[PDB]
Amino acid sequence: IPMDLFDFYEQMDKDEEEEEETQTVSFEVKQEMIEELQKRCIHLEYPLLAEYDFRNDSVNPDINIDLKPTAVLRPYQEKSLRKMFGNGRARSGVIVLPCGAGKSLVGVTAACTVRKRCLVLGNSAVSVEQWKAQFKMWSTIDDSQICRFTSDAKDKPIGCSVAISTYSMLGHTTKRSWEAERVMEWLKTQEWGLMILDEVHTIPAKMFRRVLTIVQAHCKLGLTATLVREDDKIVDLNFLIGPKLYEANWMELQNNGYIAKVQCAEVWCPMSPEFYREYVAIKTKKRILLYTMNPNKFRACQFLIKFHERRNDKIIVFADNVFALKEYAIRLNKPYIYGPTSQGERMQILQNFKHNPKINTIFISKVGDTSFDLPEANVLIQISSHGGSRRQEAQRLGRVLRAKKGMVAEEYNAFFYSLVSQDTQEMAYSTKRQRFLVDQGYSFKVITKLAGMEEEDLAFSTKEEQQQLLQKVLA
């Protein structure tokens, strides 16, 4: 019976003396006792099923957060917190929802419900500042106990939620990687007990994974929309944070005056003289440029901008590369936003795009993802298949697009487009993209021709024009 049972720590492992012989592990591996990774503590179901239990004799009895107030979440979010009360730590650990519908609120509520000494992990200071703005109803004495805790200073019991910090490892004054042995954990190194991760996909990377791996970490919650990069690490995240409690929030459940119905499309474009000579012959990182700048595909992108500006729709055009961004945008004479555009000029372009009926198309680089207030529109065009994550295409779509007036309860009232060059490595991403979006509940189709592109003025009207671009791209 476990009334005497010691349990300890060695470098990243838990060893269990004079044992109760617990299920699901090897025995006398190198001594009479059981020995697991720290990170295996998460598997509380394997003892719970057996009817086994354990005690935290290493406890520290100091004080904790109360945060008694409540607020109102979206109908699935409320169902998602209600499930978490239901399931408990044996059968909980991540939630997936867009970066534009209430993820900050799920984190402050997840900490106010769970109610333990908490450390909040985030990607960015702007997102700490959005959390703070969310959290003001549960903030103790409004503004006299909230503080930041990162590379310049630390103070107070709370802040953006409870104490927030960043994932970073540049040196001793990062935030979470450097401190990962001092505080956290109620069961050993026992100052705190609860972990809330915003942007949770960020942690399972090869160096970062160690922050999570080198503890027992009792309660853990993660929140994300991108969830994984193109190589799919996500089997690891079940171990590292916990299993996935929720994924859906389909626009099928929020149509009539609520968000958008999006017609999704992929566009297959043919390939014009000289560009495949050179695509086929070049194996280097330049070849990404011959498939993206393919003038038949540029003419589809131009025709599509013309069609939605003629109807006065608002359009964001995404370009994965600053070269591509500027070659498309300067030719189409639409503003662009990227790293080196200053804040003053970005807030002028974005205010113009949202309020001015003359400024209806803009071009944007990778800087929109990860802590950025992308504006509203009704049309999204991606010039390329990229290598950022099929799941980030759906986060980006979801956070940017809304219903056009009048038509707020129809089958579709917003539009997404991804442009693909036929007979290239750009095509490989489609059978995955297509399966992903339809599994996310989206109506998605393939458009393979445009015989009305043969009825109007567009660029690249000759071989000589196309040759002028081909020489510039090759250089």
Partner 1 sequence: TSGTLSPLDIYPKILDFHPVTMATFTMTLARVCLCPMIIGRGNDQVAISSKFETREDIAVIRNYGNLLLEMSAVVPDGIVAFFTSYQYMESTVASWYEQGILENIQRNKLLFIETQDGAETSVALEKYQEACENGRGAILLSVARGKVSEGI
Query: Which residue's CB is nearer to partner 1, number 82 or number 472?
Result: 82
Q: Measured from the CB atom, is 77 or 161 closer to partner 1?
A: 77
Q: Do 429 and 385 form a contact (C-beta atoms < 8 A)? A: yes
With respect to partner 1, which residue has the nearer C-beta, 75 or 88? 75
Per-position x/- string for 207-246, each x denoting binding to partner 1 as judged by CB under 8 A, each - no binding: ----------------------------------------
Using the structure block, give the residue that is written with the tokens 């207030």: 373
Instruction: Work out how close the CB of 75 gets to partner 1 at its nearest, in angstroms, rounded to a whole number.
Output: 6
Contact positions with partner 1 (CB under 8 A) in 13-72: 70, 72
Please tell me whether residue 78 binds partner 1 under the rule CB under 8 A.
Answer: yes
CA-angle at 29, arms to 26 and 30, nearest 5°: 165
Stretch that binds partner 1, among 7-15, 73-81, 193-201, 409-417 (CB under 8 A): 73-81
Closest CA to 450 of 312, 316, 265: 265
Least distance in angstroms from the C-beta of 259 to partner 1: 17
Task: Quote the least distance from Cβ 155 to partner 1, whole Å.
Answer: 33
Nearer to partner 1, 79 or 463 (CB): 79
C-beta separation of 214 from 180 below 8 A: yes
For partner 1, give the closer residue by CB, 102 or 388: 102
**AA identity, residue 118:** C
Taking the C-alpha atoms of residue 475 and residue 472, their distance in angstroms, rounded to an integer, is 6
Listed ranges 21-29, 79-87, 211-219, 275-283: which one lies at the site for partner 1 (CB under 8 A): 79-87
Smallest CA-to-CA distance from 363 within 315, 402, 430, 323 is with 315
Numbered residues of the known binding site: 97-104, 399, 402
Instruction: Find, among 452, 413, 84, 36, the residue nearest to 246 by Cα.
Output: 84
Answer yes or no whether residue 86 interacts with partner 1 by CB under 8 A. no
* Size of the residue set binding partner 1 (CB under 8 A): 8
Q: Are 300 and 419 in contact (CB under 8 A)?
A: yes
In the block, tokens 């504006």 appear at 375
> Smallest distance, Å, CB 84 to partner 1?
12
- Shortest reach from residue 139's CB to partner 1, in Å: 19
Checking phi first, is residue 199 left (phi over 0); if not, alpha (psi -120 to 50) or beta? left
Stretch that binds partner 1, among 78-86, 255-263, 322-330, 335-343 (CB under 8 A): 78-86
Which lies closer to partner 1 via its Cβ, residue 73 or residue 408? 73
Tell me how far, at minimum, the Cβ of 68 lies from partner 1, in Å: 12
Closest CA to 414 of 443, 373, 453: 443
E strands, 167-256, where? 194-198, 219-224, 244-247
Contact criterion met (CB below 8 Å) for 363 and 325 = yes
Beta strands in 395-452 (DSSP E): 414-421, 443-447
The binding site for ATP consists of 97-104, 399, 402
- As measured in angstroms, the least distance from the Cβ of 217 to partner 1 is 28
Give the separation between CA 135 and CA 133, rounded to whole angstroms. 6
H or E segment to which residue 167 belongs: none
Nearest to 219 by CA among 242, 203, 239, 198: 242
Can you tell me the distance from the alpha carbon of 430 to that of 217, in angstroms, rounded to the nearest whole number? 39
- C-beta of 43 vs 83, nearer to partner 1: 83
- 318-331 burial string, b = 16+ CB within 10 Å, else e? bbbbeebbebbbee
Q: Examine residue 137 and tell whether it contacts partner 1 (CB under 8 A).
A: no
Check residue 377 and report its DSSP letter. B
**What would the x/- binding string for partner 1 be over residues 434 to 473, using CB under 8 A?**
----------------------------------------
Chosen residue from 81, 265, 282, 408 binding partner 1 by CB under 8 A: 81
CB 335 within 8 A of CB 362: yes
Q: Which helix (H) or strand (E) holds 179?
A: none
Between residues 79 and 331, which has the closer beta carbon with respect to partner 1? 79
Question: Among 5, 44, 48, 73, which residue sits at the site for partner 1 (rule: CB under 8 A)?
Answer: 73
- Residue 450 CA to residue 267 CA, distance in Å, equals 10
Q: Which stretch binds partner 1 (CB under 8 A): 77-85, 203-211, 217-225, 250-258?
A: 77-85
Stretch that binds partner 1, among 75-83, 86-94, 245-253, 391-399 (CB under 8 A): 75-83
Interface residue with partner 1 among 4, 8, 79, 129 (CB under 8 A) is 79
What is the closest distance, in whole angstroms, from the C-beta atom of residue 73 to partner 1 in the complex? 6
82 binds partner 1 (CB under 8 A): yes
Whether the CB-CB separation of 150 and 175 falls below 8 Å is answered with: yes
> Least distance to partner 1 from the beta carbon of 69, Å?
10
Q: Which of 24, 29, 75, 407 binds partner 1 (CB under 8 A)?
A: 75
Spatial CB neighbours of 129, under 8 Å, sequence gap ≥ 6? 160
CB of 143 to partner 1, least distance (A): 24
The CB-of-65 to partner 1 minimum distance in angstroms stands at 20
Give the residues lining the site for partner 1 (CB under 8 A).
Answer: 70, 72-73, 75, 78-79, 81-82
